[PDB]
């Protein structure tokens, strides 16, 4: 109970306070709760050796604090309480009515962290209630990483050329055409891509795909528009010996695995 989705721009080096119910008085609409952790010495190490380029062009720590509120059970999405207001060592941190219906998403609140071991951090968090909705709160200690990081990982997890084919087949039992070139980004595919789920055989630039969800991050397949989760994702081999076969062709047309442009 109170578990998050998993972000794939993420590693979790640590749980600092495990999910935590923010209970509520039923009395009162507005609540407040207060919260410590104590980071390790090689923990404020950890974050002050991280610094780095970031999307957006900002030299900051890769390493990082991140707090995420979520309803109350399996993995959710990150939501907020109405009227959320969050401080961290009493500074308010800027987030990024009955009906709050704006997206919640995970926090960074690195820079109001005191990058000490010999004190505790605290995190004041305010809400307003609403009937039947509970909240959790956890704070974790993340490495941020980037798309060239995701996209290495994500090859060393590719797909037999012989498992498209026989969708080729199992599909044609006319003519069956596909484009080389990405509908994302509009070049030649690179990485071919996609999801597990999707019943097409036209692919997408793995790379691109990354570098948008890194910025704007929806996962929804560029093809087909189902999802397109990162965990679902896999490399098309077939694509890939096309692709070291063909040069200024953008389209192939199948027959019963052959392929004509
Ligand atoms: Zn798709």
Known sequence: ?????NLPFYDVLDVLIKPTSL???????????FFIFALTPQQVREICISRDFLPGGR?????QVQLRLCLATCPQEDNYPNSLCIKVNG???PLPGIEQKRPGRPLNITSLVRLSSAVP?????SWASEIGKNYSMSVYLVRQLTSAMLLQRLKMKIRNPDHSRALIKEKLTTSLRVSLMCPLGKMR???PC??????????????????????????????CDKKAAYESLILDGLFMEILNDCSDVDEIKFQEGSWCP
């Open 121 to 125: 951090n605290q995190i004041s968090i």
């Open 59 to 63: 030299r900051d720590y890769t390493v």
């Open 91 to 93: 500074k308010l941190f």
């Open 1 to 5: 109970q109170g578990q998050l989705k």
């Open 194 to 223: 996609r999801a597990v789920t999707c019943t097409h055989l036209q692919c997408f630039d793995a790379a691109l795909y990354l570098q948008m969800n890194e910025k704007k991050p929806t996962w929804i397949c560029p093809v």
């Open 23 to 33: 209970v509520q008085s039923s009395i009162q609409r507005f609540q407040e709760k």
């Open 189 to 191: 595919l690179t990485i």
